[PDB]
């Protein structure tokens, strides 16, 4: 999932752009995927209980 | 670049180029010393 | 605010190439003459 960015491929963002806004794009991607992982962990905790 | 005769300056030629692969590096072998002024683009980054 | 140490580097470059003095930029000057780090901090002053 693009998570609101231009492309969903990390190395594509690295190669196709300069560091200034590539950093913003990668920040967005990391935040989105970390949030998804947190949601999965919470679901697993509830199911375990 | 290897034509026998070039057109006069007042009736200057016009050549269109499209759908081709261009290797500009060869253009560095024309003369030992020659002007290569480029506007708006660095000559060393013309191959990308 | 005040800093630990200050480095000053001065030179003369062409007018079109002034945009190449920036973090993450590429070209003749950026690659073969003067490279800036991606996490650069500080200022550039360019005057004709």
Swiss-Prot record, chain A:
Reported function: Subunit of the fusion protein that is processed upon entry into the host cell. Mediates fusion of the virion and cellular membranes by functioning as a class I viral fusion protein. Contains a viral fusion peptide that is unmasked after S2 cleavage. This cleavage can occur at the cell membrane by host TMPRSS2 or during endocytosis by host CSTL. In either case, this triggers an extensive and irreversible conformational change that leads to fusion of the viral envelope with the cellular cytoplasmic membrane, releasing viral genomic RNA into the host cell cytoplasm.
What protein name does the entry list? Spike protein S2'
What part of the full protein is here? 968 to 1016 of 1273
């Amino acid at each position: 999932s693009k998570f609101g960015a231009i492309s969903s491929v990390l190395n594509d963002i690295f190669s196709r752009l300069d560091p200034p806004e590539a950093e913003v794009q990668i920040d967005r991607l990391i935040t989105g995927r970390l949030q998804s992982l947190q949601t999965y962990v919470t679901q697993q905790l509830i199911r375990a209980a | 670049f290897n034509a026998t005769r070039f057109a006069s300056v007042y009736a200057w030629n016009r050549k269109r180029i499209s759908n081709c692969v261009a290797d500009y590096s060869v253009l560095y072998n024309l003369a030992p010393f020659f002007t290569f002024k480029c506007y708006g683009v660095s000559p060393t980054k013309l191959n990308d | 605010l005040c800093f630990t140490n200050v480095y000053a580097d001065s030179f003369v470059i062409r007018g079109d190439e002034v945009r190449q003095i920036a973090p993450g930029q590429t070209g003749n000057i950026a690659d073969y003459n003067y490279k800036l780090p991606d996490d650069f901090t500080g200022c550039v002053i360019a005057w004709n």
